[PDB]
Amino acid sequence: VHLTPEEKSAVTALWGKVNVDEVGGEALGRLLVVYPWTQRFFESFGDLSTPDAVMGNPKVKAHGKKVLGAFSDGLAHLDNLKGTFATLSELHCDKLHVDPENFRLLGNVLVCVLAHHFGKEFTPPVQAAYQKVVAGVANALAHKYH
């Protein structure tokens, strides 16, 4: 995806402020709570019977941290998302068979978490730039389907 230098600027300035040990698990937690069919793919994580149970679940935090690591990785490779995400696409597509609509969903949930964490600072232009980004990652993660 092509971000303008003003879009690039919006994305990276906010991102340096992100708690990378936390924001991932908050976005995964919320995905599982808001779109509970996604709990299908996480049967082994244990107690998911409640919202608190999800957010407080150590496995949800542990795994969301890796997810956020992968997002950080595409933010460094905006012009090579297809390349960056190949292995993960192979995994979620060929091995896991997660429907790609869910990639767009997790992207949007992350946007919601950023808005929650940053308030006023997550301005409508800043959101627009992050939408191009999570759109680009979803699409690259889904390449093993195209």
Partner: protein, 140 residues
């Protein structure tokens, strides 16, 4: 189906929004136009620039519709009948666009309700906006 817990959660967040609801409705519309430019073509006679009076006035109409939907949560098809007619028959709004505006309405709440936007409440509001969306697209 919206559960009692969901009806309670949505009524809660509505309450904290209080009288900022038209302003937040305008902000959600701008978030949508910037983030998903395809939606702009439904407003060819609006100035969609920041601070636009027309976007402000429309924001208030959207927030008032959603407030009417909360207030008549058990009878949404009937409360939203005229608007489902409008959006499906006259305006021919593509159903995908309801998802985009719902997402921006959620972002706008999240950006303004640190305390109220917990995971349970986010779930309940998502379900509420999806129910309104279902009503508004029921009439093609």
């Amino acid at each position: 189906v919206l559960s009692p817990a969901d009806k309670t959660n949505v009524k809660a967040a509505w309450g904290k929004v209080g009288a900022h609801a038209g302003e937040y409705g305008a902000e959600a519309l701008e978030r949508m136009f910037l983030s998903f430019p395809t939606t702009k073509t439904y407003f060819p006679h609006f100035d969609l620039s920041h601070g636009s009076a027309q976007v402000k006035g429309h924001g208030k109409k959207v927030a008032d519709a959603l407030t009417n939907a909360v207030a008549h949560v058990d009878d949404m098809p009937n409360a939203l009948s005229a608007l489902s007619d409008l959006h499906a028959h006259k305006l021919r709004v593509d159903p995908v666009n309801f998802k985009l505006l719902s997402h921006c309405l959620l972002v706008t709440l999240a950006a303004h309700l640190p305390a109220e936007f917990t995971p349970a409440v986010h779930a309940s509001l998502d379900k509420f906006l999806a129910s309104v969306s279902t009503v508004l697209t029921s009439k093609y």
